[PDB]
Amino acid sequence: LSAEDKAAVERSKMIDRNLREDGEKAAREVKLLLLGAGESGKNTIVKQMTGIVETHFTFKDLHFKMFDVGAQRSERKKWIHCFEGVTAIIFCVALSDYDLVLAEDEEMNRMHASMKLFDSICNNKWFTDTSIILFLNKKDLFEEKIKKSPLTICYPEYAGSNTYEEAAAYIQCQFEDLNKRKDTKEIYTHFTCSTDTKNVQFVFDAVTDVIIKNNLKDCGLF
Amino acid sequence: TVSYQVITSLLLGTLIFCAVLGNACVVAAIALERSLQNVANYLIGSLAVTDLMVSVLVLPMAALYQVLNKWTLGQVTCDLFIALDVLCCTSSIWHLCAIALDRYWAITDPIDYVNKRTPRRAAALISLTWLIGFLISIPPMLGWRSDPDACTISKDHGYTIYSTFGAFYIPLLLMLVLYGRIFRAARFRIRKTVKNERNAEAKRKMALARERKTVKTLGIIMGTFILCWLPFFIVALVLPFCESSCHMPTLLGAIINWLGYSNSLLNPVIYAYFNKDFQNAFKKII
Amino acid sequence: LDQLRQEAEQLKNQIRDARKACADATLSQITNNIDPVGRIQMRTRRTLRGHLAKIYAMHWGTDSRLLVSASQDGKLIIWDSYTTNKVHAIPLRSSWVMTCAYAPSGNYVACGGLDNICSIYNLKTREGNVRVSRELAGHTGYLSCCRFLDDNQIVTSSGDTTCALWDIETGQQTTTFTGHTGDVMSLSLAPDTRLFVSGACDASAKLWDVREGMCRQTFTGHESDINAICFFPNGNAFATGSDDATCRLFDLRADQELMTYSHDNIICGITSVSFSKSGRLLLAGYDDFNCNVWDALKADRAGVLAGHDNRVSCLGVTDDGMAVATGSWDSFLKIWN
Amino acid sequence: TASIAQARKLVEQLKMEANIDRIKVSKAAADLMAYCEAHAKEDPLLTPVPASENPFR
Ligand SMILES: CC(C)CCC[C@@H](C)[C@H]1CC[C@H]2[C@@H]3CC=C4C[C@@H](O)CC[C@]4(C)[C@H]3CC[C@]12C
Ligand SMILES: CC(C)CCC[C@@H](C)[C@H]1CC[C@H]2[C@@H]3CC=C4C[C@@H](O)CC[C@]4(C)[C@H]3CC[C@]12C
Ligand SMILES: COc1ccccc1OCCNCCCOc1ccc2c(c1)NC(=O)CO2
């Protein structure tokens, strides 16, 4: 109608097209939520690949944005729903922490704190159908520490011999038994160390598997 | 007439009304609810539109033909009816093919799914489907270079082979191949997953449940299409070649024709009534 | 230590007794003989579309037609509510926004979130574009709410259990408000901008003097986190909305709670609260996708606004009192009369 | 020395909150009712207005 009204309408249309273009660009992104109890190797994982840290990387033409909220030391349930709708949760746990108590002792193990955090995030109402890539870092240091000291310090009800393979298998079993949504989500467990160069490949494989299984569910085949 | 045309008309009208209602409900749900607006549902809704066009244009004239045992609408209307029947049925079958192909790409190429899959792809698939329908329906209008009481498609051998293979047999082969590859991919993904013994047994039970579910799904998908359209195209292929050797009973021919036509009624149930998103959308809108 | 704890206990008991002494009559008894508001029925006059992710905050401008909305698609969008036109679309450096504010002069907007930064954008430039004017970084937790006092002062609440008054020109914290033990989730300036109330996850509300930076009063009647807070237009009372499925009204001078707005069939949390122009109506957004209009004097459900398919995250009444805006997780804004 | 300092800070904050003067709840409720009655007419959401005066139709 009026010249100013027409200019406003054209401005709004241009803004609309820019917004839809930005949405199209951002839809071609795989969003990952990075978590872990303390510093259990998150930084190592990020190197291998304010208040929230964003790491963007493209692997095999697939773009990933990973959001780390470790420095956010507040009430998690006040913002955890902000990450509803991520493709996957990358949860990092240090295998060497089975004997270390904590930053402040508080007679609670670092491994038990990690297990509690994993249980809470895995069975969170916002992530009923979100998959978890479970990185178990520091396997070399864990092997040394299990050579020197028993695993019974962390898990008193342990019967296997003090060797890396079955100790790590028992730890993985303990972590994966915390999943109550066994018919809705899967846990992709990987033992990592500092020198490993296949972590990004493992994440890519887990993400492609998640995408394919979601498509199968949509087609009624899963 | 007194005891036969009434029940025949009642049954045919009930079928036509149910088909129209189902397809219209699917289209309305997709056009209303934003949770049903993606490429797959766009293909499904395009299939619903094609089946609705069937049930609105072709099915009434076919039902009148069935009840009166005679074509009363004239030669021009007979030609238009044949063209619409061919176009709409071909478009429906190739819509099934397009849905299968999109599912195959989504299951076998997650990278393409994330990066290069857009509603433009659904638009191109629908356009190609309708183009194939036009290509199958045009030769009768162009001449491909009688009985006034009956409306019958051309019985030329060349056009018979052309129409039957370009409308049902090549699509059937494509559907079989695509869903076989999809079945292999699904079986691989299901089997790749497989106290410790209790967890292992639970995982095995879940894998068996998923295998049975995918077998049931593909069985329903392929069996509906086959048991609806295969007898019709078998008859339409073998009958024109043995003109005098084999005769087709009228009752069996009518059963076969309407069995083929029931696919436009069963496709909504298969594609947008068994789907969880569609069920939730219906519950919300109701 | 222990003696100090006992003295603190005695002080708490003394405050409770002094507040119980003032409770002579109930607000329900005082308002029992007034005409009920009736059935309040509003209709969606406008629908604003263009956000592609959840909406977390909106704020009306002082002209009552321009509003700002913030969404996790990393977008700060300024809407003309009359024509539904979009005037600005600000690309956020961090997409994890949880609050936005409109300056009273209309020359600036602010936002913030999980980046712990309060970003101030200038809307009045020579070439007519929007550029980041300032970034306020001192907070060590997520920014939950912010409100301008003028073009150069802004008050923020943070998940680090702290509020802060910022001078925008220098970027420093002019004042820091401490005393909450949980994350501060909401913030409401008094009409004269001399005081402000804040609600936190400690199930407590606190009144702060802007000039002196001290907690005047503490109000504790909620049994869960306080998610929203709003000032009555008098400036002598305020309303708090918590996730115990209850809104509450507190009076500054009476120094206690007057009314509790709750229903048996309402069990979800309250995300946002606001008052009508006269303060007779209290509008509250809920997790169950609906907004409820309460009679603020009789505590009765006057009306329901049901037009969102996801959680109503925010709401705001215009300054002239003509319209109410709701913003939901379903990425749509709605203007109701 | 942090625990005793925090306890003393809480004690002085409690004293500052306690040494205030409060009015009656009946008086506060009467003031709220008076405000709502004095501004009841110019409240469009409480008092629906004709569409000719409605910017949102
Ligand atoms: C014309 C239409 C209605 C025909 C539909 C036929 C459907 C219902 C039939 C055809 C083939 C059938 C499947 C054949 C084999 C099996 C494997 C068995 O372990 C479970 C049942 C299951 C999975 C059947 C389910 C039902 C099934 C899919
Ligand atoms: C879901 C349902 C409705 C789909 C399948 C319906 C089937 C059973 C219906 C649809 C149309 C029907 C046909 C319509 C007309 C005639 C002609 C009559 O002289 C004999 C029966 C016969 C040949 C009917 C047989 C049954 C039939 C094929
Ligand atoms: C040969 O096919 C096709 C060829 C190419 C594409 C699609 C094709 O598929 C057509 C499906 N539709 C055929 C039947 C229409 O013709 C009749 C319908 C009902 C009738 C009769 C004929 N005759 C009766 O006696 C009474 O009922």
Other beta carbons within 10 Å of B274: 14
Q: In angstroms, what is the resolution? A: 2.4
Atom of ligand 2 nearest to the CA of B18: 3
CA distance linking residue B64 with residue B9, whole number of Å = 8
* B70 is annotated as contributing to ligand binding: no
- CA B63, CA B7: separation in Å to the nearest integer? 12
Residue of chain A whose alpha carbon sits nearest to that of C54: A82
B165 annotated ligand binder: no
For residues C56 and A81, the answer to whether their CB atoms sit within 8 Å is no
* Domain presence at residue C200: no
**Cα separations (Å) of B255 from A131, A150, B228?**
50, 77, 11
Which of C1, C23, C280 is facing D25, going by the closest CB pair? C23
Question: Is B186 in contact with A218 (CB distance < 8 Å)?
Answer: no
The β-bridge relationship of strands A187-191 and A131-137 is parallel
To the nearest whole Å, the CA of C29 is away from the closest chain D CA by 9
Structure tokens at B171: 């699509």
Q: Are A122 and A132 in contact (CB under 8 A)?
A: yes
| Domain-wise residue ranges, chain D | 4-56
Give yes or no for a contact between C258 and C231, defined as CB atoms under 8 angstroms apart. no
Most A CBs within 10 Å, among B105, B114, B179, to test the A interface: B114
Whether residue B277 contacts residue B38, with contact meaning beta carbons closer than 8 Å, is answered with no
In the chain, the amino acid numbered B101 is L
Q: Give the tokens for residue B239.
A: 């009958």
Choose from C86, C90, C115, C185 for mutation: most chain A CBs within 10 A.
C86
Q: CA of B253, closest CA in chain A: separation in Å?
A: 35
d(CA C11, CA B100): 74
**Residue A115: how many other CB atoms lie within 10 Å:** 19
For A91, the 3-state DSSP assignment is strand
Please report, for residues B9, B18, B172, B234, B251, the alpha-carbon distance to residue B67 in angstroms, rounded to integers and kept in the order given.
6, 18, 31, 24, 12
Is A160 an interface residue toward C (CB < 8 Å)?
no
Spatial separation of the C-alpha atoms in residues C61 and C55, rounded to whole Å = 18
CA distance C171 to C73: 27
Q: How many Å is the maximal CA-CA distance in chain A?
A: 84
d(CA B99, CA B76): 34
CA distance B200 to C56: 43
- What are the chain C neighbours of D11 within 8 Å (beta carbons)? 4, 7-8, 11
Tell me, yes or no, if C142 comes closer than 8 A to chain A by beta carbon: yes
**Phi, psi at residue B229, to the nearest 5°?**
-105, -20
| Number of residues that this document lists for chain B | 286
Backbone φ and ψ for C151, nearest 5 degrees, come out as -70, -10
Q: A102: which 2 tokens?
A: 């904590």
Q: What is the bridge-based pairing of β-strands A88-94 and A30-35? A: parallel
CB-CB neighbours of C34 under 10 Å: 13
Beta bridge partners of B62: none
Tell me the CATH number for domain D4-56. 4.10.260.10
The rounded distance, in Å, linking the Cα atoms of C185 and C143 is 8
The answer to whether A10 faces chain C, any CB pair under 8 Å, is no
**Residue B4 to residue C285: CA distance in whole angstroms:** 62
| Cα distances (angstroms) measured from residue A201 to each of A45, A58, C159 | 12, 11, 36
Report the distance separating Cα A42 and Cα A39, nearest Å: 6
Assign residue C46 a region (left: φ > 0; alpha: ψ between -120 and 50; beta: otherwise): beta
Tokens matching residue C129: 């574009």
Residue A191: how many CB atoms within 10 A of its CB?
Answer: 18
Tokens of A85: 């709708």
- Contact: B186, A222; criterion CB under 8 Å: yes
For residue C326, list its beta bridge partners: C315, C334
Q: Which residues of D touch C46 (CB under 8 A)?
A: 56
Q: Which residues pair with C57 in a beta bridge?
A: C70
The closest of B105, B102, B128 to B39, measured between CA atoms, is B102
DSSP letter, residue B4: T
What's the start-to-end Cα distance of chain C, in Å?
57
- First CA to last CA across chain D, in angstroms? 65
Which of A129, A181, A207, A219 to substitute to test the interface with B, most B CBs within 10 Å?
A: A219
Are B275 and A211 an interchain contact pair (Cβ–Cβ within 8 Å)?
no
For chain B, the residues before each gap (C–N > 2.5 Å) are: 145, 194
| CATH number, residue C249 | 2.130.10.10
H/E segment holding residue B40 = helix B39-53
Q: Which residue of A has its CA nearest to B107?
A: A212
Question: Domain total for chain A?
Answer: 1
d(CA C270, CA C281): 16
> How many Å from the N-terminal Cα to the C-terminal Cα in chain A?
55
Calpha distance C278→C294 (Å, rounded):
13
Q: Cα Rg for chain A, rounded, in angstroms?
A: 21
User: Which chains would you list as touching D if contact means 3+ CB atom pairs under 8 Å?
Assistant: C
Rounded Cα–Cα distance for residues B24 and B142 (Å): 33
Dump the DSSP string for A93-139.
EEGGGGT---SS-TT--HHHHHHHHHHHHHT-GGGTT-EEEEEEE-H
Q: Is residue B223 marked as binding?
A: yes
Q: What residue type is A175 in one-letter code?
A: F
Kindly report the CATH number assigned to the domain that includes residue B75: 1.20.1070.10
Q: Which residues of B166-197 are buried (b: 16+ CB within 10 A; e: fewer)?
A: bbbeebbebbeebbeebeebbbebbeeeeeee
Using CA of residue A179, residue A185, residue A190, residue A192, what is the dihedral sign?
Answer: negative
Residue A49: inside a domain: yes
Query: If you measure from the C-alpha of residue B249 to the centroid of ligand 2, how many angstroms do you get, rounded to a whole number?
Result: 15
- Chains A vs D: touching, with 3+ CB pairs under 8 Å? no
Nearest CA to ligand 3 atom 26: B66
The response to whether residue B87 sits with its C-beta less than 6 Å from ligand 2 reads no
Taking the C-alpha atoms of residue D49 and residue D56, their distance in angstroms, rounded to an integer, is 11
Helix, strand, coil shares of chain B, percent, nearest 5, are 85, 0, 15
Contact C73 A9 (CB under 8 A): no
The tokens for C231 are: 């000032």
- Distance from residue B211's CA to the centre of ligand 1 (Å): 13
Asked whether B158 and B140 are in contact (CB, 8 A), the reply is no
* Side-chain-facing half-sphere of A207: CA atoms under 13 Å: 27
Q: Which of B54, B58, B55, B46 lies closest to B128 in space, CA to CA?
A: B46
Within-domain flag for C321: yes
Q: Which residues in chain A are contacts of C242 at CB distance < 8 A?
A: none
| Closest to C168 measured CA to CA, from C157, C158, C153 | C153
Dist CA C71 CA C329 (whole Å): 9
Burial class (CB in 10 A: 0-12, 13-18, 19+), B254: middle
From first CA to last CA, the distance across chain B in angstroms is 41
The reply to whether residue C14 touches residue D18, judged by beta carbons under 8 angstroms, is yes
**Is A222 a member of any domain?**
no
Token duo for residue C121: 């954008």
Residues for chain C: how many in total?
337
- Asked whether the beta carbons of B50 and B92 are under 8 A apart, the reply is yes
Angle formed by the axes of helices B263-272 and B250-261, nearest 10°: 30
Cβ of residue B10 lying under 6 Å from some atom of ligand 2:
no
Q: Cβ A18–C87 below 8 Å, yes or no?
A: no
> Which residues touch A136 (CB under 8 Å, ≥6 apart)?
A93, A95, A168, A171, A172, A175, A189, A190, A191, A192
Paired tokens of C332: 């749509």
SS (H, E, C) C59-92: EECCCCCEEEEEECCCEEEEEECCCCEEEEEEEC
Q: Does the beta carbon of B220 sit less than 6 angstroms from any atom of ligand 1?
A: yes
Q: What is the CATH number of the domain that holds A93?
A: 3.40.50.300
Alpha carbon A189 to its chain's center: 11
CA distance readout (Å), C235 to C194, C197, C211: 10, 10, 17
Place of tokens 């510093």: A39
Residue with tokens 């308002």: C31
Q: Is residue C188 part of a domain?
A: no
Query: What is C85-149 written as a DSSP string?
Result: EEEEEEEPSSS-EEEEEE-TTSSEEEEEETT--EEEEE---SSS--EEEEEE---SS-EEEEEEE
Nearest CA to A91 out of A41, A142, A31, A141 is that of: A41
The whole domain housing B230 covers: 5-285
CA-based nearest residue to C61, from C87, C43, C98: C87
CA atoms of B157 and C179, how far apart (whole Å):
92
Q: Checking DSSP bridges between strand C97-102 and strand C85-91, what pairing results, if any? A: unpaired
A50 neighbors C115 (Cβ within 8 angstroms): yes
- Residue keyed to tokens 């489907």: B129
How many of the other CB atoms lie within 10 Å of CB of B161?
A: 14
Range of the domain at C284: 42-150+223-336
On chain B, the residues whose CB falls within 8 A of the CB of A221 are 107, 182, 186, 213-214, 217-218
Ligand 2 mutation target, pool B6, B14, B15, most atoms within 8 A of CB: B15
C-alpha A138: how far from chain center: 17
Crossing angle between the packed helical segments B75-108 and B39-53, to the nearest 10 degrees:
160
